[PDB]
Amino acid sequence: KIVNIGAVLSTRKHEQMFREAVNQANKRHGSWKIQLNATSVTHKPNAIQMALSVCEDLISSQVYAILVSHPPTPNDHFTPTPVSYTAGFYRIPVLGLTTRMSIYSDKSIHLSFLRTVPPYSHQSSVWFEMMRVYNWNHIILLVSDDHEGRAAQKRLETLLEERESKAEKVLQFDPGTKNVTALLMEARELEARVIILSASEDDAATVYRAAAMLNMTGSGYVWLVGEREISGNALRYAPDGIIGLQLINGKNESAHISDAVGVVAQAVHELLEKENITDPPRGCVGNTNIWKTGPLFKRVLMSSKYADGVTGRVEFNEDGDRKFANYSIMNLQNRKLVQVGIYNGTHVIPNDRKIIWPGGETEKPRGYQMS
Amino acid sequence: LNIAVLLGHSHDVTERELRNLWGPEQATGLPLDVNVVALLMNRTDPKSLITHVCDLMSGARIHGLVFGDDTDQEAVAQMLDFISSQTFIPILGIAGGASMIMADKDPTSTFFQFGASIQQQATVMLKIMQDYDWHVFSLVTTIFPGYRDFISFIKTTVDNSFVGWDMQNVITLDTSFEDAKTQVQLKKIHSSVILLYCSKDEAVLILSEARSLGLTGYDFFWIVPSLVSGNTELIPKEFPSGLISVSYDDWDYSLEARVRDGLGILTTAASSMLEKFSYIPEAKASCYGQPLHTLHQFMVNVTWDGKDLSFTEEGYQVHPRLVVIVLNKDREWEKVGKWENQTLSLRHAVWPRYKSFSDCEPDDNHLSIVTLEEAPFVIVEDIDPLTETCVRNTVPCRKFVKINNSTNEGMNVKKCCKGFCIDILKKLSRTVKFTYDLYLVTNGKHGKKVNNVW
Ligand SMILES: *[C@@H]1O[C@H](CO)[C@@H](O[C@@H]2O[C@H](CO)[C@@H](O)[C@H](O)[C@H]2NC(C)=O)[C@H](O)[C@H]1NC(C)=O
Numbered sequence: 171k172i173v174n175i176g177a178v179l180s181t182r183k184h185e186q187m188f189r190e191a192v193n194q195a196n197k198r199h200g201s202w203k204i205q206l207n208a209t210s211v212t213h214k215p216n217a218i219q220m221a222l223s224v225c226e227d228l229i230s231s232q233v234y235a236i237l238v239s240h241p242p243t244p245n246d247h248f249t250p251t252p253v254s255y256t257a258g259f260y261r262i263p264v265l266g267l268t269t270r271m272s273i274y275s276d277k278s279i280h281l282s283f284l285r286t287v288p289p290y291s292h293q294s295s296v297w298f299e300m301m302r303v304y305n306w307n308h309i310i311l312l313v314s315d316d317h318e319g320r321a322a323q324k325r326l327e328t329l330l331e332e333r334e335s336k337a338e339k340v341l342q343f344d345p346g347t348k349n350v351t352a353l354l355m356e357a358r359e360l361e362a363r364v365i366i367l368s369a370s371e372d373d374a375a376t377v378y379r380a381a382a383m384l385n386m387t388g389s390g391y392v393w394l395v396g397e398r399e400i401s402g403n404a405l406r407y408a409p410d411g412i413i414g415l416q417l418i419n420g421k422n423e424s425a426h427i428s429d430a431v432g433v434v435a436q437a438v439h440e441l442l443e444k445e446n447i448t449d450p451p452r453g454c455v456g457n458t459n460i461w462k463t464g465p466l467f468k469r470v471l472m473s474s475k476y477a478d479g480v481t482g483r484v485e486f487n488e489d490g491d492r493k494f495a496n497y498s499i500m501n502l503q504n505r506k507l508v509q510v511g512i513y514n515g516t517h518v519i520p521n522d523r524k525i526i527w528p529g530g531e532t533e534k535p536r537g538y539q540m541s
Numbered sequence: 542l543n544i545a546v547l548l549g550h551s552h553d554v555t556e557r558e559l560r561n562l563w564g565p566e567q568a569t570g571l572p573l574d575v576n577v578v579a580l581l582m583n584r585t586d587p588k589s590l591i592t593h594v595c596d597l598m599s600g601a602r603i604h605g606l607v608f609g610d611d612t613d614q615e616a617v618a619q620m621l622d623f624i625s626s627q628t629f630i631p632i633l634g635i636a637g638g639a640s641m642i643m644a645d646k647d648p649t650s651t652f653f654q655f656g657a658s659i660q661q662q663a664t665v666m667l668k669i670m671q672d673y674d675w676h677v678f679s680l681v682t683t684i685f686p687g688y689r690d691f692i693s694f695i696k697t698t699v700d701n702s703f704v705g706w707d708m709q710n711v712i713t714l715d716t717s718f719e720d721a722k723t724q725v726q727l728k729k730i731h732s733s734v735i736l737l738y739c740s741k742d743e744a745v746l747i748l749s750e751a752r753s754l755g756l757t758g759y760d761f762f763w764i765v766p767s768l769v770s771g772n773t774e775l776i777p778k779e780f781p782s783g784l785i786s787v788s789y790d791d792w793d794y795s796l797e798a799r800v801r802d803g804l805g806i807l808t809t810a811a812s813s814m815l816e817k818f819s820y821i822p823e824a825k826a827s828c829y830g831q832p833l834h835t836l837h838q839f840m841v842n843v844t845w846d847g848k849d850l851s852f853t854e855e856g857y858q859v860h861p862r863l864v865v866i867v868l869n870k871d872r873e874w875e876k877v878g879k880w881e882n883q884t885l886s887l888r889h890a891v892w893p894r895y896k897s898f899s900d901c902e903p904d905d906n907h908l909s910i911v912t913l914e915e916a917p918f919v920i921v922e923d924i925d926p927l928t929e930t931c932v933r934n935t936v937p938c939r940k941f942v943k944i945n946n947s948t949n950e951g952m953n954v955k956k957c958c959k960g961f962c963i964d965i966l967k968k969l970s971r972t973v974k975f976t977y978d979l980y981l982v983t984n985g986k987h988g989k990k991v992n993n994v995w
């Protein structure tokens with residue numbers, strides 16, 4: 171009857187917000203006798219005693235989905251790992267709504283890492299859509315990272331197989347170093363201007379300042395970056411005319427957690443419409459066996475169909491994330507955040523503003539040399 | 542240093558003999574403050590060992606953890622990876638769920654498993670398939686984790702082969718079992734060797750489905766790794782007698798020898814740490830209210846007592862003990878073969894046919910075939926000296942070659958056979974659908990009766 175819900179240490183009003191979502195979701199899902207409850211956590215920076223409080227409370231509480239919603243960590247941990255591993259020990263899905271790393275989003279490492287947000291590598295897919303925008307074909311891969319970078323490279327070559335063109339050069343290395351000006355010279359000596367860039371904040375900002383001390387900021391140098399490359403001092407260490415991407419309703423935490431709890435509530439009522447109701451055990455004391463219908467619960471969850479949503483028409487893909495979300499295309503027009511494009515499920519719509527390049531005029535540079 | 546060795550309850554191993562496993566040993570103890578704490582835990586929830594780490598890392602800064610699990614759960618290894626990443630303490634998963642195969646260990650963790658990787662285990666299994674020339678096969682992978690790298694390694698290893706492996710299209714289970722679309726994939730299966738990639742309970746379900754659909758024939762072989770099979774103490778239903786497995790869970794090379802080898806590796810690392818560095822205790826105070834040198838990248842090619850216990854780049858051993866087992870007629874995992882440093886050891890290289898996998902299952906398509914070398918028909922040549930591989934338009938043969946002129950005992954030399962009647966017999970086996978069983982003659986010529994003695 172009663173169903174407990176775990177909470178996150180972020181702030182105070184989101185708890186009342188999903189209690190309002192509890193009050194609204196029980197009305198629109200029949201007169202079934204289900205009951206909904208909640209369980210709060212405390213303010214701990216490390217996730218160690220946080221996961222200790224989870225296994226003290228939430229395993230015995232028989233929660234159905236823990237929705238981790240703390241992106242702004244004061245340290246550089248960004249680790250929802252131990253609570254996710256504790257829930258996957260009894261095969262319970264965790265909605266990790268903090269970061270967009272593919273090393274978290276791996277189904278090989280993480281068992282039931284089912285959230286509503288996709289990793290940053292999907293932006294590369296949007297970059298494939300950018301290859302449909304300006305109709306450019308000769309591209310050069312440059313990823314500083316290695317863990318998410320190799321999977322982004324795999325899906326990039328998978329989409330690259332469709333056009334049957336190829337990238338001119340792929341580049342993966344070890345971040346943290348600064349003697350990559352030889353790599354900048356190797357990038358200069360290639361006949362493509364598509365600079366596919368993917369790194370962290372400080373590393374991408376440092377290699378871009380190294381490129382700026384190498385004359386890679388002039389006309390024809392086409393730069394294409396993501397969210398981690400426009401954050402912090404990389405926002406400061408960005409030129410005047412670069413094209414970046416942005417989420418829609420990703421930083422909007424309220425609507426995100428709102429339709430997340432709506433997804434969880436309709437999934438719980440959908441499983442209650444289904445048979446073979448098995449509850450996760452109270453594994454804290456004595457119980458060593460695991461909840462066997464975890465992948466059965468994933469078979470329930472991966473076949474979810476929707477028609478309405480607060481942030482938008484949510485839908486799980488083949489990997490359990492959002493199909494073709496609302497995206498923004500930003501242009502840092504003279505150190506000012508100027509939005510120049512949007513992207514719906516299948517198409518890029520520019521606004522009434524112009525598209526200013528870091529080099530010449532507003533028209534696209536013909537960066538394909540005659541060799 | 543201070544080392545807490547907590548274990549499970551596998552094979553009813555007592556906690557008392559481990560105290561004298563190191564006590565009278567360690568004659569040249571160069572690290573002085575080295576002690577052992579033998580412990581057992583009757584529950585396998587994460588909370589227990591988390592409490593153990595928090596009260597023993599604070600318990601006078603214990604620097605050593607050796608854990609062995611008796612259950613069949615692989616997420617315990619992920620929890621140990623997290624603990625070794627956070628606490629920065631070298632942890633050695635020994636057996637059971639303590640050293641089960643996960644996807645990719647963390648670079649900032651010092652955890653190790655005493656087993657082989659899935660790439661090495663797939664290499665050993667394809668070495669078995671090369672040594673038995675079972676070139677027609679299939680591949681069944683579920684949504685069990687780590688499948689894309691595994692299928693990729695199989696496809697590249699076929700591409701890295703001189704065989705030309707007949708690989709059927711890979712059967713992929715997208716969701717749970719439905720018996721609507723999975724049955725269509727099972728009907729597409731008509732190869733010999735079935736390669737399954739799932740859990741243990743899902744393996745029992747798929748074997749029961751194949752037994753219900755008649756897909757458990759004598760042609761239909763079954764090779765799974767140790768992670769599918771698991772520990773020896775649980776043998777569920779619907780298993781063919783002859784169930785091929787490769788595991789490192791040796792009951793002969795028991796738990797005490799495993800933890801003594803772990804003690805030897807830890808003393809080798811501590812001796813090299815004292816000969817290289819001064820501050821030997823490196824630990825953390827407590828779990829609540831929150832490094833100098835890494836022992837992960839310190840003891841790479843460690844060798845204790847002449848045992849090749851060197852480390853890989855993925856936390857595995859370079860040469861662990863790989864044991865090939867099958868299921869006998871008495872429902873037990875019978876030990877068959879081992880693996881050397883390079884050569885695959887095959888004690889039962891003469892493959893038994895297993896006419897009876899279950900009660901009412903006869904096999905009547907094994908035809909014993911002997912021949913004599915004739916030039917246009919029976920062309921018997923050597924096997925490859927590099928790869929031990931016949932080209933796949935030939936068939937294998939064996940011969941009881943006697944070594945000496947006086948003795949009668951010899952070897953079974955296996956060689957390649959091509960010719961006309963070779964192709965005739967192969968087209969018969971493609972037509973009559975039997976299994977040819979070729980060997981060579983050792984008595985001599987065709988036939989001659991000497992007083993009712995042919
Ligand atoms: C039903 O839900 C309520 C609300 O979560 C539970 O009441 C307690 O509320 C406080 C916050 O005021 C929190 O500590 C927990 O959410 C609840 N207590 C604890 C310690 O669990 C109430 O317990 C739930 N009832 C049941 C039995 O499920």
Ligand SMILES: *[C@@H]1O[C@H](CO)[C@@H](O[C@@H]2O[C@H](CO)[C@@H](O)[C@H](O)[C@H]2NC(C)=O)[C@H](O)[C@H]1NC(C)=O
Pocket residue numbers: 481482483494495496514515
């Ligand atoms: C993405 O954003 C667009 C913004 O236009 C949303 O589309 C609107 O949705 C409302 C219903 O919520 C309807 O009036 C129309 O479907 C759209 N209106 C206009 C004027 O565009 C969309 O819901 C969002 N979701 C997706 C598809 O990601």
Ligand SMILES: *[C@@H]1O[C@H](CO)[C@@H](O[C@@H]2O[C@H](CO)[C@@H](O)[C@H](O)[C@H]2NC(C)=O)[C@H](O)[C@H]1NC(C)=O
Pocket residue numbers: 514515516517519
């Ligand atoms: C927003 O997505 C919609 C849905 O696909 C797009 O509408 C399609 O556009 C193509 C190309 O013009 C047409 O051939 C289809 O018939 C449209 N499908 C419909 C009617 O939904 C649309 O292109 C995207 N945004 C806009 C307004 O350009």
Ligand SMILES: *[C@@H]1O[C@H](CO)[C@@H](O[C@@H]2O[C@H](CO)[C@@H](O)[C@H](O)[C@H]2NC(C)=O)[C@H](O)[C@H]1NC(C)=O
Pocket residue numbers: 847881882883
């Ligand atoms: C291990 O591989 C080597 C080469 O095939 C074999 O020789 C051993 O080499 C190691 C090197 O450290 C020596 O310590 C041993 O004394 C050698 N043993 C012998 C008898 O030669 C060895 O045969 C292989 N091991 C096995 C199990 O066969």
Ligand SMILES: *[C@@H]1O[C@H](CO)[C@@H](O)[C@H](O)[C@H]1NC(C)=O
Pocket residue numbers: 348349350351352
């Ligand atoms: C990279 O290395 C070369 C050779 O040491 C050096 O000349 C160059 O300045 C370095 N680039 C930077 C600025 O890191």
Ligand SMILES: *[C@@H]1O[C@H](CO)[C@@H](O)[C@H](O)[C@H]1NC(C)=O
Pocket residue numbers: 382383384385386
């Ligand atoms: C770029 O080239 C111009 C002209 O040669 C030169 O004045 C300028 O200093 C260069 N900038 C750098 C630091 O790359």
Ligand SMILES: *[C@@H]1O[C@H](CO)[C@@H](O)[C@H](O)[C@H]1NC(C)=O
Pocket residue numbers: 421422423424425
């Ligand atoms: C999300 O957007 C709504 C307005 O639609 C706003 O009230 C709310 O504060 C936003 N959430 C946050 C915390 O950004």
Ligand SMILES: *[C@@H]1O[C@H](CO)[C@@H](O)[C@H](O)[C@H]1NC(C)=O
Pocket residue numbers: 444445446
């Ligand atoms: C419940 O499980 C049984 C097998 O025990 C199965 O036959 C049945 O279809 C399942 N029902 C549903 C739809 O949950």
Ligand SMILES: *[C@@H]1O[C@H](CO)[C@@H](O)[C@H](O)[C@H]1NC(C)=O
Pocket residue numbers: 581582583584
């Ligand atoms: C066995 O179970 C008891 C239950 O209290 C527990 O205290 C103990 O740690 C377990 N381990 C041993 C000593 O077998």
Ligand SMILES: *[C@@H]1O[C@H](CO)[C@@H](O)[C@H](O)[C@H]1NC(C)=O
Pocket residue numbers: 842
């Ligand atoms: C591996 O063993 C060799 C020979 O003892 C020696 O170089 C060293 O111990 C190991 N390798 C290195 C360079 O660490």
Ligand SMILES: *[C@@H]1O[C@H](CO)[C@@H](O)[C@H](O)[C@H]1NC(C)=O
Pocket residue numbers: 944945948950
């Ligand atoms: C064959 O002869 C050799 C040399 O005398 C001897 O070593 C070997 O044991 C003999 N084999 C048998 C089994 O008689």
Ligand SMILES: *[C@@H]1O[C@H](CO)[C@@H](O)[C@H](O)[C@H]1NC(C)=O
Pocket residue numbers: 943944945946
């Ligand atoms: C003894 O056996 C060898 C083959 O091993 C054969 O070549 C030889 O002819 C035999 N001895 C005699 C004298 O026949």
